[PDB]
Amino acid sequence: DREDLVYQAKLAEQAERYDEMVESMKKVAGMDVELTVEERNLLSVAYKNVIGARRASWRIISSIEQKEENKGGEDKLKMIREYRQMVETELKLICCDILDVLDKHLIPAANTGESKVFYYKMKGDYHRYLAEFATGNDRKEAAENSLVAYKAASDIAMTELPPTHPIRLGLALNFSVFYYEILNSPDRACRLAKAAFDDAIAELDTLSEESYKDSTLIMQLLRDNLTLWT
């Protein structure tokens, strides 16, 4: 199976039929074993695209709702908010699907610095995506449940992974995003962004040509945010 199932998940990625890519890699996750860097990323990508679609929809749907609050038309607004919530269910369903795989199947089964830090970061992201659309004491619940799960990968990263390791750098990229977006803290976002970038500069000397490539790209993203946010 598992030798095949990963190829089934590769085909879905190419076909861009991510709903299958998920199902394939959930069947690999549900083996309760050490996922290879590949399997880790294939799973990672599958859910990112699936949620991605709904997230994109949501922002757009809210763009019409806000464009019809300014326009004042409060008859369409009834159907539109009916439509945004329909998505918000899927955003709830998808997020809660993957988180459920992480704390039950993946996180327990993890036994390497990378995969340990990989999954806690992941847990942060989907709690964040929950927090992205939510309101009131629903936001604060998943906001604090992310800030914990990010801070958990942060701590395990700072001993097991070097500062130039992309998984750690992507964490800081997403964590910085968490402050600027979720907690509305533009300062701590940048400080954490620049911080993550600045610690990386030193150790690039030592790493591989392909490992230098992986690091530099995520440093560009970190820098691209700091650029945009100032």
């Binding site: 990229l173 600027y180 993203l221 691209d224 946010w229």
Partner: peptide, 7 residues
């Protein structure tokens, strides 16, 4: 404004 980066 072009969109922020997340990975």
């Amino acid at each position: 404004g072009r969109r922020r980066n997340s990975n």
